[PDB]
Amino acid sequence: MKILVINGPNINFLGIPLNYDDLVEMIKGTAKGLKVKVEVFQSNHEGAIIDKLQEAYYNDVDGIVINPGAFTHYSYAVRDALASIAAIPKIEVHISNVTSVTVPVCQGEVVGLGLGGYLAAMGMLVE
Amino acid sequence: MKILVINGPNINFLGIPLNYDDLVEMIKGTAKGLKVKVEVFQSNHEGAIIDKLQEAYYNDVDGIVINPGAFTHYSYAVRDALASIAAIPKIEVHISNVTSVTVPVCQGEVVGLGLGGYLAAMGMLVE
Amino acid sequence: MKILVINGPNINFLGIPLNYDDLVEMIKGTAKGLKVKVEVFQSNHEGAIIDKLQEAYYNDVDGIVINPGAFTHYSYAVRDALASIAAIPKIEVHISNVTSVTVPVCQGEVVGLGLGGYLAAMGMLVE
Amino acid sequence: MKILVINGPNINFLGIPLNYDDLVEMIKGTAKGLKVKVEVFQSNHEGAIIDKLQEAYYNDVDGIVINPGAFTHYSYAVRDALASIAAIPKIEVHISNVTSVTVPVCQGEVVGLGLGGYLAAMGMLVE
Amino acid sequence: MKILVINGPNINFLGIPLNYDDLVEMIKGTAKGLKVKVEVFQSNHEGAIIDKLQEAYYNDVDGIVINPGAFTHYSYAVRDALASIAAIPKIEVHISNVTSVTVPVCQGEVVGLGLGGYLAAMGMLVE
Amino acid sequence: MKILVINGPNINFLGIPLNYDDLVEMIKGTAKGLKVKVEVFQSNHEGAIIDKLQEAYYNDVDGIVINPGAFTHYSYAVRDALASIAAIPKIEVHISNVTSVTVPVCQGEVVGLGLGGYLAAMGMLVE
């Protein structure tokens, strides 16, 4: 099984005590534990996220974990990108207790569980 | 006469039975029929569309056909880019029967006529 | 694919700056672009239009584009002629922003797009 | 860091397609990924859970994950056992979307995330 | 003292009689007068602005002047980028007399003073 | 281009941490930046301000920046002096967030921007 994790704008500035590299290592260590392959991606560009989602359709990704950051509350382009790949299961993640445009085009949401929310989302895709 | 056709985010995933390459062939074939030159462009980046609109002003484009996709419903930056080039006539196009921020800064809109909407828009710029 | 274009009374007096021969050249050029065969016909006689619609049924026309002119608002004979050939898809076209008796027996209407309305109608029959 | 996972009555009958041994392997694999030691325990006896909670106090467990099953809705004895060890952080977990007596004596609850809820709870204790 | 000036989308099309190169020369001349070092940046990409703000945090910039253009009215990503660097003082600028999402995360706003608004904003950071 | 800056009563006691000599150096440095000649004048006498405004008319000053201090709230003589030289553009400046008699006989007011308000006013006279 192959999983793709997508982080939106500003997420790389976690810790600015756990930082973004701590979250990446927790995700990569959990992937070995669950016996899955994982790719982790972050960008500040809305278009680079849409390109990464379109690349996932051509690369047989088995499921997607996404944290859009602030794009959750205004990016109808990322909503419609997630709607264009409806064959792939996706879970939306929020680190803090953040109405949203990307939720109804996803198979579930995890909110307010801190850095543990990604680990639930990966578990929900293995189930 | 030189026409520029601009496609917004997600439009390259048409048919994911007619697809995006079928639409490009229909536009390029119709340009020869109308005896005009055409450039067709697509990007998932909001800033690449604004760069392409600014490039058109320095390149003596005679008219613009634009399908913003989802940016129609939230991109005040693309609205104000179209407002900055008021000397050039533009037609907005929607493939499906989709309130919009980009409409009042254009000379017309074509809506819900499928892939035929681009062919009306090219005709309306020749007239 | 074979297309038939029918123009009603008075349409030959367009431009009495684009005239009727400009419209015929736009249609014939666009047909090569879309890789289709096209016949363009005009008459001032209501009965010659009904004869042309009956001829089309015996000639394996794949789709019809029609602009009835003023007959749109009173010719129940042309309505019932279009109803008699229900196996063939037809699009109704109006050049200017014109209740209509011929619309409910057609697969769609295109209105107020100038001479561009024929090009959308040909696109909608290829789709 | 040392974690203790406690499962209540009936939890060993999961899958009577994922079963209880699948959940134990997911937890043990995730523990290696997070670089923590884990003990996983299940019993049908209310008193054996209270003995295990009392043993944890003498064994320097750094955090507890607990799924009481039905005891959530009536066991004031397990509530008061969790209250007696207030120096140790605990997270409560429910597999399905199950008022509760054990919740207010814990640092958090995770509900309805399936077998993924344990993985969030371990993350929330590492954070 | 080191100052960073950020211009958003469309600002490079000022005067399409003073233009964007006049504004850059006024800012660079004023910086020598105030005895400060200045960097002036412009982009049409929302993500390139967020990258430039994140780069400023690693480069010990003493204060920021920002004119977001249209992003002022919808970019919650640029708002949250400005919030992520709260150690650095920022002034927001609007050339024309433009409710705004980026204002409450800045230490002041200058509005409707034309190209003079940048000179006040530099003064307010030297003070 | 020649600019005249007039400061009213009490302005020489700024900082009784930036003082009046700091403000004069900021103005003289900004004048070199904008490529303009500047004269800076201060007096506690209402009549010496009126003499300086009458001198400006005979010396072809291209624009005036004025901070009247408290004379803003009662000096109809300085108001009518500014009205007597309607051929010269003037900007009124207030350092702190101070109804006024001198405002309607000026081309604009700048208020509450600290010592930055003078630099905006010089920018507005070059524009």
Author numbering:
A (entry chain V), B (entry chain P), C (entry chain T), D (entry chain 2), E (entry chain I), F (entry chain E): 1 to 16, 24 to 105, 114 to 142
Provide excerpts from the study:
Icosahedral 3D reconstructions at 2.5 Å, 2.3 Å, and 3.5 Å resolution were obtained for I3-A6, I3-D12, and I3-A7, respectively, allowing us to build atomic models of each nanoparticle. Comparing the experimental cryo-EM structures to the computational design models demonstrated that AF2 structure prediction was quite accurate: The all-atom rmsd for a single monomer of I3-A6, I3-D12, and I3-A7 were 1.3 Å, 1.7 Å, and 1.4 Å, respectively. Aligning two subunits across the designed interfaces revealed that these were designed with high accuracy, yielding alpha-carbon rmsds of 0.7 Å, 1.1 Å, and 1.5 Å, respectively. In each case, the rotameric states of the interdigitated hydrophobic side chains at the designed interfaces corresponded well with the design models, as did the polar residues lining the periphery of the I3-A6 and I3-D12 interfaces. Slight rigid body deviations between the building blocks added up to alpha-carbon rmsds of 1.6 Å, 2.2 Å, and 2.2 Å across the entire 60-subunit nanoparticle for I3-A6, I3-D12, and I3-A7, respectively. These values are comparable to those obtained from previous computational nanoparticle design campaigns that started from high-resolution crystal structures of the building blocks.
